[PDB]
């Protein structure tokens, strides 16, 4: 992949692999999310970011970016062997945090097949205390980001998500991460949570519908030795409300919604 | 990737991705095994194989190949961003079954960084009854395979593995597959079992040693709604003996050995 001409966005092509596809022989939403993260990492590397994707001031102040929200809309999942092109870029959102956006295209047709957006907040790596973005970090972002707004979603991606009320309609309990679920820093990979959310969807919905939209808020991390319960209730196209919580004390780790279209 | 000049082997290049690496920023053994399976699938496609990698006679008789044994030796794990080249080929082993072999090379240096071999047996897809290879299937293999022997392991990969005796030294219990662990035909992916075996290795071994060799026998499949326990005992470099069994009735799924070298 490489930076675009203006140096303000990044593009990369991927061939969908055999083990990356589900029962209709197209990429799973987890494969898609992994690809989004890979192209994000390649972008950060190309513009001079560090394990973590920090800036110089951030390293000085022991700060990291963490994900607050991920929103993905897929119009067409690429088939096994197909080539997908992904374009990504970032923007600062003042003192609130930053945003990374993606567009997915079929590289044969050049048609948009999906779009995604994510919100990131600043966190002290040791205390794990959330903070506002300092003036000096905003200045570093400015040089690698478009100055005028550029939005993948010009709005479902901004909607408030409510907390599922007991009892849930469906559940999958006793979920735990294995080593393949961890990143190089031994944190649970953000895409694992997407998989866990989807585990409490009935196989029948999955057999008969395609996922069109997922929105996931990230409230707290699952540790390597934690155990998670995944809860879902129908709110309807079918729509669902989702909650991930620690199996023991019921501490919330994520909430989300999904929207599914009949095939 | 493509077939080599003679049409009797297949080569493919892969760039190691951000989410494919573990704590020392090199590819996990599970990433390696996934890449082995991907290049195997690309080879099969290129020589006219069909979901399943069946031949024409196999489909006619409702037969499939299943894995009986996987053996991997790694000398050097490729780093994040490195390019690895993998060469693969198959051979018939008379009426016993077939073999697929792989060689892994650094594409910058051309050095061999790893080797693998796998044994496959014929199975009736409906009855799940194992069978010998028929004369007409041997005939189909012969046109795509080298005629003279070509072994990734000329002269450990053939050693008999004993059954771990209770009590195990170490254990990880209540493992279950999620949708990301299933292949396009909804069977548990062969690489999942590797991950499950490794889960009962202590984190300290993993922190201080590199996995050099893994040998895994495949006795029976884990179904999508099964639960697995992973058992390990030190037999020693450190060596371990491994058993995967169904959590309930204790039915054996897999047995194996690993060999580890201090860093």
Nearest-by-Cβ selection for A180 from B184, B185, B195: B195
Neighbour tally for A178: CB within 10 Å: 19
Exposed e or buried b per residue across B14-53, where buried means at least 16 C-beta atoms within 10 angstroms of its C-beta: bebbbbbbbbeebbbbbbbbbbbbbbbbbbbbebebeebb
Distance of CA A7 to the CA centre of its chain: 24
Domain A170-262 has CATH 3.40.50.450: no
Pair A232, A241: CB distance under 8 Å: yes
Instruction: Please report how the helices B190-199 and B29-46 are oriented relative to each other, as an axis angle in degrees rounded to 10.
Output: 170
Q: How many CB atoms lie within 10 A of CB A19?
A: 19
- C-alpha B236: how far from its chain's center? 24
What whole-number distance in Å separates Cα of residue B164 and Cα of residue B182? Answer: 27
Please state the separation of Cα B262 from the chain's center in Å: 24
Biggest alpha carbon distance in chain A? 53
Judged by phi (left if over 0) then psi (alpha if -120 to 50, else beta), residue B91 lies in beta
The residue annotated as part of the active site, out of B43, B145, B189, B222, is: B222
B→A interface, C-beta within 8 Å = 17-19, 21-23, 25, 28, 30, 34, 37-38, 41-42, 45, 51, 80-81, 174-176, 178-180, 182-186, 189, 191, 195-196, 198-199, 206
Residue of chain A with shortest Cα separation from B194: A180
Q: Decide if A178 and B195 are in contact by the 8 Å CB cutoff.
A: yes
Query: B37: which chain A residues are within 8 Å (Cβ-Cβ)?
Result: 18-19
- Check: CB of residue A63 under 8 Å from CB of residue A122: yes
Point out which residues pair with B67 in neighbouring strands.
B120
Best CA proximity match to B235, nearest among B258, B217, B252, B214:
B258
Do the chains contact at B180 and A196, CB–CB below 8 Å? no
Domain B2-142: give its CATH architecture: Roll (3.10)
B110 to chain A nearest CA, in Å?
24
**Buried b / exposed e along B154-176 (16+ C-beta atoms within 10 A):** eeebeeebeebeeebebebeebb
- List the one residue out of A200, A228, A171, A196 whose CA is nearest residue A33: A196
| CB contacts, 8 Å: A38 with chain B | 17-19
* Token representation of residue B76: 């050097």
Task: Report the C-alpha gap between B111 and B82 in whole angstroms.
Answer: 13
How many Cβ atoms are within 10 Å of B96's Cβ, its own excluded? Answer: 14
Is B43 one of the annotated active-site residues of the chain?
no
Size of interface A-B (CB pairs under 8 A): 76
Q: Of A185, A248, A196, whose CA–CA distance to A218 is shortest?
A: A196
Q: Give A96's DSSP letter.
A: S
Residues 6+ apart with CB under 8 A from B139: none
Query: Which chain A residue shows the shortest CA-CA distance from B180?
Result: A195
Report how far residue A239's alpha carbon sits from residue A260's, in angstroms, rounded to the nearest whole number: 6
Record: contact A80-B199, CB cut-off 8 A? no
Nearest CA-CA distance, residue B42 and chain A, Å: 9
Query: Residue B11 is encoded by which pair of tokens?
Result: 């080569």
Q: Which residues of A touch B41 (CB under 8 A)?
A: 18
Considering only the beta carbons, identify the residue of A22, A184, A195 that sits closest to B184: A22
d(Cα A9, Cα A29) in Å, to the nearest integer?
Answer: 23
If we measure between CA atoms, which residue out of A177, A176, A163 comes closest to residue A231? Answer: A163
Of B30, B34, B179, the CB nearest to A195: B179
Chain B residue numbers with beta carbons less than 8 Å from the beta carbon of A184 are 18, 21-23, 25, 80
In this structure, what token pair is assigned to residue A252?
Answer: 């919330």
> Are the Cβ atoms of B206 and A179 closer than 8 angstroms?
yes
Q: SS3 of B33, please?
A: helix
Residue B46 in 3-state DSSP?
helix
* Cβ neighbours of B222 (radius 10 Å): 22
Contact B213, B72 (CB under 8 A): yes
The minimum CA-CA distance between B192 and chain A, rounded to whole Å, is: 9
Q: Where in chain A is the domain with CATH 3.10.129.10?
A: 2-155, 170-262
Cβ pair A184:B18 closer than 8 A: yes
Distance CA A112, CA B55 (A): 37
CA A143, CA A90: separation in Å to the nearest integer? 11
Assign residue B123 a region (left: φ > 0; alpha: ψ between -120 and 50; beta: otherwise): beta
**CB-based contact B16:B98 (threshold 8 Å):** no
Grouping H, G, I as helix, E, B as strand and the rest as coil, residue B45 is helix
Q: How many CB atoms lie within 10 A of CB B83?
A: 13
Strand segments, DSSP code E, in A107-251 are 112-124, 130-131, 170-175, 209-218, 228-234, 238-246
Take residue B91 and report the two structure tokens written for it: 């051979």
Q: Give the residue from B20, B9, B81 showing the smallest Cα distance to B42.
A: B9
Token pair recorded at residue B223? 């179904």
At a CB cut-off of 8 Å and minimum separation 6, what does B134 contact?
B57, B61, B122
Give the strand pairing for B238-246 and B228-234.
antiparallel
What experiment produced this structure? X-ray
In chain B, residues under CATH classification 3.10.129.10 are 2-142, 170-262
DSSP 8-state symbol, B165: P
- Integer Rg of chain A from CA: 18
**CB neighbour class for A185 (10 Å; exposed up to 12, middle 13-18, buried from 19):** exposed
Which SS3 state, helix, strand or coil, does residue A12 take?
strand
Cis ω on the peptide bond leading into residue A66 (within 30° of 0)?
no
Instruction: For residue B193, give the 3-state DSSP assignment.
Output: helix
When scoring B33, B53, B78, B178 by the number of chain A Cβ atoms within 10 A, the one with the most, hence best to mutate, is B178
Identify the bridge partners of residue B100 per DSSP, sorted by sequence position. Answer: B90, B118
Cα dihedral sign, A161-A163-A166-A172: positive
Tell me the two tokens of residue A46: 């190309």
A167 preceded by a cis bond (ω within 30 of 0): yes
Query: Are the CB atoms for A94 and A133 separated by under 8 Å?
Result: yes
User: Breaks in chain A at C–N > 2.5 Å: after which residues?
Assistant: 50, 154, 236
Q: How far does the CA of residue B199 sit from the closest CA of chain A (Å)?
A: 7
Q: Compute the distance between CA of residue B214 and CA of residue B232 in angstroms, rounded to an integer.
A: 13
- Burial, B58: exposed, middle or buried (Cβ in 10 Å; 0-12, 13-18, 19+)? buried
Output the six-digit token pair for A219: 């409230």
B195 neighbors A178 (Cβ within 8 angstroms): yes
Alpha carbon distance A22, A79 (integer Å)? 10
Q: Which residue has the tokens 């600062």?
A: A92
Interchain contact, B178 vs A185, CB within 8 Å: no
Q: State the resolution, in angstroms.
A: 1.6
Q: Which of A61, A9, A71, A62 is nearest to A215 (CA)?
A: A71
- Alpha carbon distance A153, A218 (integer Å): 20
Number of Cα atoms under 13 Å in the Cβ half of residue B103: 16
Q: CA geometry: angle at B139 spanning B134 and B141, to 5°?
A: 100
The tokens 């991907």 sit on which residue?
A: B38
Q: Which residue of A has its CA nearest to B23?
A: A184
- Contacts with A37 from chain B: Cβ below 8 Å: 18-19
Third-level CATH fold of A2-155: Thiol Ester Dehydrase; Chain A (3.10.129)
Cβ–Cβ of B38/A17 closer than 8 Å?
A: yes
Measured distance CA(A90)–CA(A79) in Å, rounded: 28
């Amino acid at each position: 992949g490489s930076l675009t001409e203006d140096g303000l966005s990044y593009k990369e092509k991927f061939v969908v692999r055999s083990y990356e596809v589900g029962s209709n022989k197209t990429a799973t939403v987890e494969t898609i999310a992994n690809l989004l993260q890979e192209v994000g990492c390649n972008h950060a590397q190309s513009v001079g970011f560090s394990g973590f994707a920090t800036t110089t001031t951030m390293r000085k102040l022991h700060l990291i970016w963490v994900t607050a929200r991920m929103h993905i809309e897929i119009y067409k999942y690429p088939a096994w062997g197909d080539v997908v092109e992904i374009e990504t870029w970032c923007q600062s959102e003042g003192r609130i945090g930053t945003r990374r956006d993606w567009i997915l295209k079929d590289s044969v047709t050049g048609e948009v097949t999906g779009r995604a957006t994510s919100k990131w907040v600043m966190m002290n790596q040791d205390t794990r205390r959330l903070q506002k973005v300092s003036d000096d970090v905003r200045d570093e972002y400015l040089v690698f980001c478009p100055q005028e707004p550029r939005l993948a979603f010009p709005n479902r991606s901004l909607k408030k998500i409510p907390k599922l009320e007991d009892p849930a309609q469906y559940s999958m309990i006793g979920l735990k991460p294995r080593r393949a679920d961890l990143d190089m820093n031994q944190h649970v990979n953000n895409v694992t949570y997407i998989g866990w959310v989807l585990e409490s969807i009935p196989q029948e919905i999955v057999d008969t519908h395609e996922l069109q939209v997922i929105t996931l808020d990230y409230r707290r991390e699952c540790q390597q030795d934690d155990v998670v319960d995944s809860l879902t209730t129908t709110t309807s196209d079918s729509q669902f409300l989702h909650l991930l919580r620690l199996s023991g004390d019921g501490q919330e780790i994520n909430r989300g919604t999904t929207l599914w279209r009949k095939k």
